[PDB]
Amino acid sequence: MRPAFGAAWNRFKEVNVNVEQVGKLLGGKVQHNIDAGIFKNACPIRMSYVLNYCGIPVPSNSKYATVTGSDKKRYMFRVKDMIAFLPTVLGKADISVSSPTPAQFAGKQGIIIFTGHGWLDATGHVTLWNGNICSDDCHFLGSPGNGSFIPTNATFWSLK
Amino acid sequence: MRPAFGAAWNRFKEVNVNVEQVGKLLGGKVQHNIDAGIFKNACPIRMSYVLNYCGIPVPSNSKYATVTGSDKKRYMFRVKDMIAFLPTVLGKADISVSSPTPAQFAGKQGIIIFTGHGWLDATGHVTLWNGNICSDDCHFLGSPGNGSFIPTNATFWSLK
Amino acid sequence: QTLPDISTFSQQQIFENWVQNRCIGKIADSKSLKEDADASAAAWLEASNLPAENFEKADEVIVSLLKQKVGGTEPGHYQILKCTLIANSDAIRPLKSS
Amino acid sequence: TLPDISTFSQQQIFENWVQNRCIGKIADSKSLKEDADASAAAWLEASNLPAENFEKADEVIVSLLKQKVGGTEPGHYQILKCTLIANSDAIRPLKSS
């Protein structure tokens, strides 16, 4: 049973802030490692928060490296782990396409993964899609926040 | 089979300058690598100049890495090579003492090698000694210029 | 010509490079260089398969080892070299295992 | 206790020279550039390779530093780039005499 989109979207909003502020909100070892400068990429951390607070607890599993927040819940810090985790709890992706544009996702709302090459620190970006925009920044072909990233795939699960 | 002390001292004086100025004097590949910042330690290069102009040409030998000056003669750039080279052309050292102090070399003049631990970039320093001072800096126990270098041995050959 | 992918390094080297880059960040007298070194370290972090705890403990080892003073014929403190010595030290070594 | 430079392989010693030199070329800090180039000269001494390998490598370094490298962070990931260069195919043949 996938989380509801509205709840997911509202939870994401709460962590749609820079990594230092994500650390302030989550506390515990998450904040400690962020304050130490060890965790920079907040992406898997945000989605860990969303999933944790929308009925999908992040497990204590060797497959997915985690640390705890002040809530004593678990948070993944590697985007590759979050990407691998999502199908194990959401089932098979509804949509998976090469050369991703919003065309393939019109009228859809849910969780989206953009994967590609060009970010040395990340194989992709995991976020929410509401049918028009993403909950932080999209990374379709030609998206303005891509930087050196070039998307080769988008994978998606409908929520609601 | 050894260079005269007076000539050696005179040659060393000509290169008793900073590494950039050593390069300006020698020209060629020596200067190129100094100007690029690749050669920092002028010590084996100075002694190569002395030997080249006191009848002991730095050879072409696989054992000792060299580059040419504008004079088309050879210059060692590794102090460990200069240290290994000297006994092969000067013969057995006249004096070899552990924990070297200046009194051990009173009334003597020639080529001296201070070896020891603590310099990450150099197993020792090669220079001339006139009985009172070295041609650049001494590295006996207690010499003011040691920094992190701890002298464990001095090896020495008299020159007439 | 083309640079190697991070994935072409061994897991050991990935951890060593994390440690080294993080050391550089700690000794850099430069805000821009520190940010660069820490962003760089976070790329090795993502590539590693080691648990967070290994990195947390390693950071403590780093702070302790950085206090060691080394030198050479040049007047500086050879910290850049020290960063590599630390990455390859016995003290860091067990943190290379899960 | 820190390991001695002699405990590294000759290949690693050359790679570290390349990485240190790279750092020396990208560092803004005067103190850090000096430290980086001093550090490099120490790897240089420990290596057994001919000078020519280093001369050519430095030219490869200047060329490869021009590569633009990126990530999710805003910077240029220069410190990462220095390591990638040290381990690049373009540098590899200079590891042999």
Side-chain angles (χ1 to χ4, degrees), chain A residues 1-19 22-160, chain B residues 1-23 25-91 93-160, chain C residues 1-59 61-68 70-98, chain D:
Chain A
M1 289 272 295
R2 304 184 181 164
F5 185 79
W9 190 269
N10 291 325
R11 296 296 75 72
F12 191 99
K13 276 185 68 178
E14 288 159 352
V15 287
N16 190 31
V17 289
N18 66 41
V19 64
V22 173
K24 282 172 168 295
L25 182 75
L26 305 183
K29 189 61 68 65
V30 172
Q31 175 182 2
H32 185 271
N33 289 344
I34 285 170
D35 290 345
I38 296 178
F39 293 174
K40 289 284 170 165
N41 191 357
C43 170
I45 299 173
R46 294 189 184 98
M47 195 57 53
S48 290
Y49 175 74
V50 171
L51 289 174
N52 271 318
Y53 288 88
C54 296
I56 311 287
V58 172
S60 128
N61 187 321
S62 57
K63 280 175 185 154
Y64 318 112
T66 64
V67 296
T68 60
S70 58
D71 51 14
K72 296 179 174 57
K73 287 176 183 305
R74 317 222 49 110
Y75 294 83
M76 302 187 188
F77 60 94
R78 300 199 167 102
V79 73
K80 73 190 186 196
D81 288 352
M82 175 59 58
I83 291 171
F85 178 63
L86 284 167
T88 74
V89 289
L90 301 186
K92 201 165 180 287
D94 296 329
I95 306 166
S96 179
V97 298
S98 291
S99 304
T101 72
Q104 297 107 323
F105 307 92
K108 310 288 179 161
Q109 61 177 33
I111 296 172
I112 192 166
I113 301 176
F114 306 97
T115 55
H117 64 267
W119 279 342
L120 301 159
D121 68 310
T123 49
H125 182 75
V126 179
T127 194
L128 306 179
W129 166 250
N130 78 346
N132 288 289
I133 59 175
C134 287
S135 53
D136 49 8
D137 264 8
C138 292
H139 297 283
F140 296 100
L141 293 173
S143 286
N146 278 351
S148 57
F149 184 73
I150 298 189
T152 54
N153 172 278
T155 293
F156 170 93
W157 293 261
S158 292
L159 301 183
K160 288 187 169 178
Chain B
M1 41 104 126
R2 298 184 188 169
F5 184 75
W9 192 266
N10 290 338
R11 299 295 76 70
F12 195 99
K13 281 211 300 293
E14 289 156 359
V15 292
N16 190 28
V17 289
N18 66 43
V19 68
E20 175 184 348
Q21 289 307 313
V22 174
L25 194 160
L26 297 175
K29 245 309 137 51
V30 169
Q31 179 174 4
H32 180 268
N33 291 339
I34 283 166
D35 287 345
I38 295 167
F39 292 173
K40 288 281 177 168
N41 186 353
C43 170
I45 303 174
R46 294 192 185 98
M47 198 55 53
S48 297
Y49 174 78
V50 172
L51 297 171
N52 278 333
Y53 293 101
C54 291
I56 310 193
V58 168
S60 161
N61 187 310
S62 55
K63 287 175 186 173
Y64 322 114
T66 65
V67 297
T68 55
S70 71
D71 58 11
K72 309 191 183 200
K73 301 182 192 308
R74 305 173 200 86
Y75 294 84
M76 302 189 189
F77 60 89
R78 299 200 168 98
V79 69
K80 75 187 186 197
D81 289 350
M82 177 57 59
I83 287 163
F85 177 62
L86 284 171
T88 74
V89 289
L90 295 185
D94 301 328
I95 298 170
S96 178
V97 291
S98 53
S99 302
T101 46
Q104 301 185 275
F105 300 89
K108 300 274 168 51
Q109 57 174 39
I111 296 162
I112 192 167
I113 301 176
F114 305 98
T115 47
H117 61 267
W119 278 342
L120 288 162
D121 67 310
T123 51
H125 179 76
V126 184
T127 191
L128 310 179
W129 166 256
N130 78 350
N132 192 249
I133 55 170
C134 293
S135 50
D136 61 351
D137 301 279
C138 292
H139 294 287
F140 292 104
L141 256 59
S143 298
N146 287 344
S148 61
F149 182 75
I150 303 175
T152 60
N153 170 280
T155 293
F156 170 92
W157 295 263
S158 284
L159 306 181
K160 315 187 165 191
Chain C
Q1 211 206 316
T2 56
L3 301 180
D5 202 89
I6 288 191
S7 75
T8 70
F9 293 75
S10 71
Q11 280 292 320
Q12 300 300 113
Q13 292 161 352
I14 285 165
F15 192 74
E16 289 161 3
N17 296 343
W18 182 86
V19 171
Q20 203 245 11
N21 286 186
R22 178 138 180 104
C23 283
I24 291 170
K26 290 185 185 305
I27 53 102
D29 59 324
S30 172
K31 181 167 182 287
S32 303
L33 199 27
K34 185 183 200 321
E35 297 171 0
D36 185 308
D38 290 345
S40 296
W44 298 114
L45 175 74
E46 171 78 21
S48 184
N49 292 326
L50 289 174
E53 192 190 0
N54 295 49
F55 297 89
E56 301 172 11
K57 295 186 179 177
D59 199 64
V61 171
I62 289 170
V63 172
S64 180
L65 287 183
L66 275 178
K67 296 174 176 179
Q68 281 228 314
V70 295
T73 61
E74 295 288 315
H77 302 306
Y78 289 74
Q79 309 232 87
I80 287 295
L81 207 158
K82 187 194 316 168
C83 296
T84 290
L85 299 188
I86 287 172
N88 292 276
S89 71
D90 285 5
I92 283 285
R93 193 165 343 270
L95 303 171
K96 287 163 169 179
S97 301
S98 58
Chain D
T1 262
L2 303 176
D4 195 87
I5 291 179
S6 73
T7 73
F8 291 77
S9 69
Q10 283 283 320
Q11 298 294 306
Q12 288 162 357
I13 285 171
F14 191 78
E15 291 164 354
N16 298 339
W17 179 88
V18 173
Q19 198 234 25
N20 288 190
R21 293 275 307 164
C22 282
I23 294 174
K25 289 176 191 307
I26 60 91
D28 50 352
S29 140
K30 171 177 177 161
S31 164
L32 195 95
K33 286 192 284 211
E34 284 167 9
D35 183 310
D37 291 343
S39 294
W43 298 113
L44 170 72
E45 171 79 17
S47 181
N48 297 315
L49 292 169
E52 183 168 58
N53 296 51
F54 298 90
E55 300 168 20
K56 288 170 176 170
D58 209 66
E59 298 168 6
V60 170
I61 288 164
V62 167
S63 176
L64 293 181
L65 278 173
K66 297 163 152 68
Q67 306 266 317
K68 262 157 179 168
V69 110
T72 67
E73 290 297 299
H76 302 304
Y77 288 78
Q78 300 275 42
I79 288 296
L80 173 52
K81 186 192 302 169
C82 294
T83 297
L84 302 184
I85 289 173
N87 291 277
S88 63
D89 288 354
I91 285 284
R92 172 156 306 104
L94 305 171
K95 290 161 161 185
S96 306
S97 55

